[PDB]
Amino acid sequence: QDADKLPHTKVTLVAPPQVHPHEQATKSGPKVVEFTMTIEEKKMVIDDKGTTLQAMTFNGSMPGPTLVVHEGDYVQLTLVNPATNAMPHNVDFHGATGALGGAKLTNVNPGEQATLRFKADRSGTFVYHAAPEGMVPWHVVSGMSGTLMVLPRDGLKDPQGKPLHYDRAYTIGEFDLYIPKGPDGKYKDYATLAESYGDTVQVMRTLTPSHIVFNGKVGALTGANALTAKVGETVLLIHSQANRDTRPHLIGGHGDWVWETGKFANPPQRDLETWFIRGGSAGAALYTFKQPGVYAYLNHNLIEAFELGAAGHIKVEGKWNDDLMKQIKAPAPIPR
Amino acid sequence: QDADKLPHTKVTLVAPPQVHPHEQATKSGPKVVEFTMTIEEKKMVIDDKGTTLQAMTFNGSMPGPTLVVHEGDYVQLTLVNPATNAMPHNVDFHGATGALGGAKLTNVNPGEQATLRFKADRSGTFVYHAAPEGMVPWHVVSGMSGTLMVLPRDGLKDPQGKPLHYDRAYTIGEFDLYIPKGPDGKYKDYATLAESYGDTVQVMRTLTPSHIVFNGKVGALTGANALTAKVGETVLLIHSQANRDTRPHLIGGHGDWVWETGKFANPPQRDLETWFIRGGSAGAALYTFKQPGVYAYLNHNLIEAFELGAAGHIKVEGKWNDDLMKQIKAPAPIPR
Amino acid sequence: QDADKLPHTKVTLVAPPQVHPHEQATKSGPKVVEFTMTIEEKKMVIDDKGTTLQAMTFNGSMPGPTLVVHEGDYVQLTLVNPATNAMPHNVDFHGATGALGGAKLTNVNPGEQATLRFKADRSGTFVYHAAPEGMVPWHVVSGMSGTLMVLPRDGLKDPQGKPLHYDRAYTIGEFDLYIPKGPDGKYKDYATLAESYGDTVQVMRTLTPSHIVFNGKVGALTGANALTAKVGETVLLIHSQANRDTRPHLIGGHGDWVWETGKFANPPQRDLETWFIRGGSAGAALYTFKQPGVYAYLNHNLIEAFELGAAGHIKVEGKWNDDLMKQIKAPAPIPR
Ligand SMILES: [Zn+2]
Ligand SMILES: [Zn+2]
Ligand SMILES: [Zn+2]
Ligand SMILES: [Zn+2]
Ligand SMILES: [Zn+2]
Ligand SMILES: [Zn+2]
Ligand SMILES: [Zn+2]
Ligand SMILES: [Zn+2]
Ligand SMILES: [Zn+2]
């Protein structure tokens, strides 16, 4: 079909880690699916000792919201760069074909907006990210990425073609941050975004992040903001990393079905302990909970997880199953 | 089946790089398979210039021993933390479901033991490692990991379902070490384990290991301690890395059949030159030797292998095959 | 067949990024395919601010040329080390079986040559690299690697066994470089190759490259030296990394069919955004261009690409397709 002859629909985005309401399998034919995002540059507190980032975001969040369409839909995005921002921006969709992912067609200075349409002709989770000429890595590592999910029109399938469902989807964006320090050994705090640029590029070139965070801060997905589920529920965990490799793992769980390269026309792998998201990609895992409790979902470079920030929690309600795991003898003195 | 109604069997563990005797395909029904491991904290010499590590081990070795069961068995582990140790420990099995892999059910202070049972309901090689609250990466990088192998009850299979066998299994645990240096540029030697903690965490956060070793020391699997095989024999090479990515390679060989993500319900890949073990996982490769000689088995970041320690040897007996490789002209002067 | 009873053919190599003329599917039976390469040590300018590398090359280029054979052929290489070089060299073929990949049979001092034959019995892209005893990583990171491609005799196939073709092949070798700096913060320039050794090894052990380049220099595959193609053409992109992981990506394109582990008896994955080449391997991707313009082909650690050098261009001729991507509204003032 010709996109100019198709019906249009408008989607209201939601903030991560939620994903906007959508169908899995659908009876709908292809549509032009309209979205809007507004860029917001802002200073953000990223850890528990007051460190700040001169951040750059789509729609005020790290990651930007997840956009969901079905294969054969057209994505039509209006990208807005308000006059209160300092820098030019654009967007590169890995799900799109041509013009550097759309980056060449979406160059917006502060005070400007643009609208891009592209055919979502390949199923999968795909990164989108800013890519302004001459300062591409800086905008990405400062927060400008998220995920486009293009579902098969018949929903997700296992390697034999059997249907797979999820009850809840969550989106996790992992961000390798490069916060400079001064000669006093303290992280720098900058009054403006432009002031932070040359110091940050120097840290970037060391390839050693100061922090690695989920969803914008150490501990973002913990406490009141933990992910939630129940025994018997199947969750889809979408994981994006626009710049650097990561290795997701659910402590005390598994990836039941995982597309680590994130492309749903390929058969998934089952029973994974840890999977691998290549820098510059998004992947997806399904898991059905069988035990209650508080799980950790983390990057299994455990230094990156526990020392630098790349870890969250999932609080799961339900009945403990002693067939799967039982404490036979609690900790007690060693017999002599 | 209900584990409380099943027969029990006890396994005697052996030290790496060997793997305790086991069946591949079996006619046995499911069992409760009992194991015991005793934690040993100890100072270890890890290189040829006298550098020491304040190490932490399962059963006195790096890696801990490999535990082998079949899918549908229950693993029942007694974990002992003698009063001669300084730190609390526990164990997280990636092969297990619930309670942070069993970590929440196995918290043993010095002087204590505990017994955990879990269903091994997924086939594959899976990491196990210590994970005490608040100091998880330190115990892992100090030596506390090994592998659980859960074999399919019908043995290993290729992508078309044809049977695959091994004649010998070897287990290789690769350890990224973070040994601090003092202001004199020498590696530090500590009188106690606790003394080493804060200096080590600082090195860990740089994400740059001082050493990367197989099986506890530079050169551990060389000389008298080389792996061995013969032409015509098929070996299974189990490779674990609980914290950091690695890329195994057999110089002058291949991975005939490789499960790089380590999960036997997925079809393996064939003819690999180099495979990839995600940090936080164990994988497995089969190879049938066709040429005699001394092979190297290494991490193919060659700096990590040759400069930092991530390399071993395999000495293979048998008849040279000129059909596979022949020296046509030995080194000699260039003609003019 | 017995190689001594087969017909011989001689191939004239070409310089990267081209690949010598070859058939995909062939009616030919197996042959002994003869090649010659001459080692050249030379100082090379690797960036736009005059930094030099004391380099080591096969046939004067980084990477060495790509050698193409079909499965069941024998590769017969004459390796020449002229008396104008300073160091001993050899070659390790990951496509070969035995004698450390051929390294033990090809030890050539300056003034010597040797000839090696091996059976190419496994299909795929395979790294070859120098591996002289005691200085293996130094020769590799200084430039001594390239690719052997062993095509299936029936050409490339998709996961269902349907034929796949390419119209043009390009070879990209990615090199992590370790250029020392002096106490003045400037990169060192050395008068001889041997002078550079101890300083370079120290940088290598930090695991942080100073530069990461395609094909021997920052910008090597840009400007007049950009790759080229047309809409409707299918290209094969061969990517080698002998020492360190990389994550190839085509901006505004995809990997239509990708063998990321590089072994053609395994089914490829489709629709990839970014793929993963393990250090010590070569992989291959097919893409059919659908839009004209200048694409970037890069390592999607964007710091590694844009700050350190791991990026090239592909200039593609043809007709823009608004069905795939259209600018609906060009950048303009935000409405109030
Ligand atoms: Zn319309
Ligand atoms: Zn459900
Ligand atoms: Zn990108
Ligand atoms: Zn019992
Ligand atoms: Zn055998
Ligand atoms: Zn773990
Ligand atoms: Zn002949
Ligand atoms: Zn064509
Ligand atoms: Zn090699």
TrEMBL record, chains A, B, C:
Zn(2+) 5 binds at D92, H94, H129, H300. Pathway: Nitrogen metabolism; nitrate reduction (denitrification); dinitrogen from nitrate: step 2/4. It comes from the Bacteria. Zn(2+) 4 binds at H89, A130. Zn(2+) 1 binds at H8. Zn(2+) 3 binds at H70, D73. GO terms for cellular component: periplasmic space. The keyword Zinc applies. It is found in: Periplasm. The keyword Metal-binding applies. Zn(2+) 6 binds at H165, D167. The modification Pyrrolidone carboxylic acid is found at Q1. Mg(2+) binds at S281. Belongs to the multicopper oxidase family. NCBIfam families: Cu_nitrite_red. This is Copper-containing nitrite reductase. The lineage of its organism: Bacteria, Pseudomonadati, Pseudomonadota, Betaproteobacteria, Burkholderiales.
